[PDB]
């Protein structure tokens, strides 16, 4: 346990905290809290209780159907031979409906199960979003999490709702497969002229990167200032403290400007939530609005120019 | 437009500037949004038919 506020050297335990009182109508928490010395050596040790109401139960049950369907077909292709199942797991996956069905409901064989397990996974998330909304207002909390989770969901549906349907073919939808879905994103790009030139795709990376960047700063800074109680952000947001009182000066002296203990968390939010925002878009545009982002770039004089040390002929025009 | 009489009451729940500027914003976007959508397929009044092409004949 090296102390750079990395691992809690000495842990202590108190009676299982059954969460704070909820409002009327909200079922009582369930689950006997557990304690883990190891886990707790990372952060908190106590576990649960967990809430589970209508939306919750309706969700945990819903999406649990999709997962089954998927894992089922997977173990199905392997001819129910677990041996080869745990072998080709990565490869195994529930493929979408063939283009010879458009959007029509295909038979369980040719793409059916996918669609089904899809809607069950589509609503499973939409429903889960409400589940979170019910956990916010029940605690007088705001909906910053729902707003974000929403954004993510946006891009999630772009991969099936808004784009595929806008294309008129369930073929342009990601498959239920660890590896095969990697090929999806692998093919999509190839199909649309290289996402490197797709504007939104870049903007989105700036976030996948920025995101990682900030937390690398914040998560760190808070620790570096964890000495002066820099982890207790809440009472810091209310009445500024010494932690946040030097915590900024650092950044200020280093990069010139800075933000407040609260402020930053707002940047982080928009630097992360905006990630998928530029995600669903960059994909909502591809296939529909644009078809070849390479020529699209050069069309606007984007694509860089390189000398010609290597070039190939074209047997088509020739022959 | 008779409703005008009992309509006043509305302001009693919606704040003065809360929904005031909330609209000044909805329009702004919706505006540029429309010209934008219209400019695409509906009718590219700017560079389509008339007088377009003059940027080529006598232009260059």
């Amino acid at each position: 346990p090296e102390y750079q506020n990395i691992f809690t050297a000495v842990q202590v335990r108190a009676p299982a905290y059954p969460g704070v009182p909820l409002p009327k109508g909200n079922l009582p928490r369930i689950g006997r809290p557990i304690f883990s010395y190891w886990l707790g050596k990372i952060g908190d040790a106590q576990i649960g209780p967990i809430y589970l109401g209508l939306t919750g139960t309706l969700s945990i049950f819903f999406g649990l159907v999709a997962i089954s369907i998927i894992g089922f077909n997977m173990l199905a292709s392997v001819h129910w031979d677990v041996f080869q199942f745990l072998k080709h797991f990565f490869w195994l996956g529930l493929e979408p409906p063939p283009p010879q069905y458009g959007l029509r409901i295909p038979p369980l064989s040719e793409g059916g199960w996918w669609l089904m397990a899809g809607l069950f996974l589509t609503l499973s998330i939409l429903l889960w979003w409400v589940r979170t909304y019910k956990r916010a207002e029940a605690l007088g909390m705001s909906q910053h999490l729902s707003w974000a989770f929403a954004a993510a969901i946006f891009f999630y549906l772009v991969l099936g709702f808004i784009r595929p349907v806008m294309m008129g073919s369930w073929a342009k939808a990601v498959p239920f497969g660890i590896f095969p879905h990697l090929d999806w994103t692998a093919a999509f790009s190839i199909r649309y002229g290289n996402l490197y030139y797709n504007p939104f795709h870049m903007l989105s990376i700036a976030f996948l990167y920025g995101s990682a960047l900030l937390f690398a700063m914040h998560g760190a800074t808070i620790l570096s200032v964890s000495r002066f109680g820099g982890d207790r952000e809440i009472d810091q947001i209310t009445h500024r403290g010494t932690a946040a009182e030097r915590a900024a000066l650092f950044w200020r002296w280093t990069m010139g400007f800075n933000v407040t203990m609260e402020s930053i968390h707002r940047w982080a939010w928009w630097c992360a939530v905006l990630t998928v925002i530029t995600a669903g878009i960059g994909i909502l545009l591809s296939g529909t609005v644009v078809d070849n982002w390479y020529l699209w770039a050069v069309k606007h004089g984007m694509a860089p120019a390189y000398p010609e040390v290597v070039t190939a002929v074209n047997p088509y025009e020739t022959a | 437009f008779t409703m005008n009489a009992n309509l006043y009451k509305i302001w009693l729940i919606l704040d003065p500037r809360r929904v005031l500027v909330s609209i000044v914003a909805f329009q702004i976007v919706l505006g540029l949004l429309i010209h934008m959508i219209v400019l695409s397929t509906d009718l590219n009044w700017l560079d389509d038919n008339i007088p377009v092409s003059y940027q080529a004949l006598g232009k260059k």
């Binding site: 649960g48 999490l145 993510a152 960047l213 937390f215 914040h218 998560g219 982890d231 809440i234 694509a303 | -």
Partner: protein, 280 residues
Amino acid sequence: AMLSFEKKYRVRGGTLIGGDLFDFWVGPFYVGFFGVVGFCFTLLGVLLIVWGATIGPTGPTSDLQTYNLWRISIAPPDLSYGLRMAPLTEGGLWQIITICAAGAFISWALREVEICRKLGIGFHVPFAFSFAIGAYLVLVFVRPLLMGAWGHGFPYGILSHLDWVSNVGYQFLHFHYNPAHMLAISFFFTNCLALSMHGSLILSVTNPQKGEPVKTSEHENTFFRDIVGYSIGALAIHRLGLFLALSAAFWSAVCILISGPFWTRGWPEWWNWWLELPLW
């Protein structure tokens, strides 16, 4: 110009090299030894990067030479020279400029070091920033070295360094199958999943519903305990994050390094070791 609470912190000392000399503040920034250093690299390089836009692929009078931020590019020398300095024109710029990158990045960290040394804060930030720099030291030094050619580096072109990422990527076919690469990716995603979660919660407890007080850590814990059961902890997240962030970069560094020096075949194939296992 200082913040409402700055003056009482601008203490003298805590310098690594020739501090007393440059030990002072220029606006909201700090100089010191490393302060001047980085600058001596900034303009010496930033301008060279411009000189490249000026000059161009072949010449300043060429039709290739452009100033479009997108088309701008500063590619390294051929793989012929290997570990040799190529003509400033034919790769020289990149080579030199890059040497300025390390002088800027590293110094920038070192500068942060003593900066923290003054605030008596933790050296987390810099140590964290190290990885980023380290990752760079891999995409230009480590990898190229084990490849025997400074030409293996990536072009310094806003969009130019994307192709270098596409080729080297496909150079191993479906680059999506890289173990380290995958792993790393997960982290980048987890991280973003963390931010979207952390930042959100804070604002959701310090700015609750209308006519509501500022919630306490008492809620935070319950909140995530009612949606998924467990709550990592206050600083825990600030730990977890820092972890993901670094881990994301670390595993990535490995990701590209292994690609080439430690593997020439196609990544998709590497996974075969799992297949050719005497179990199936």
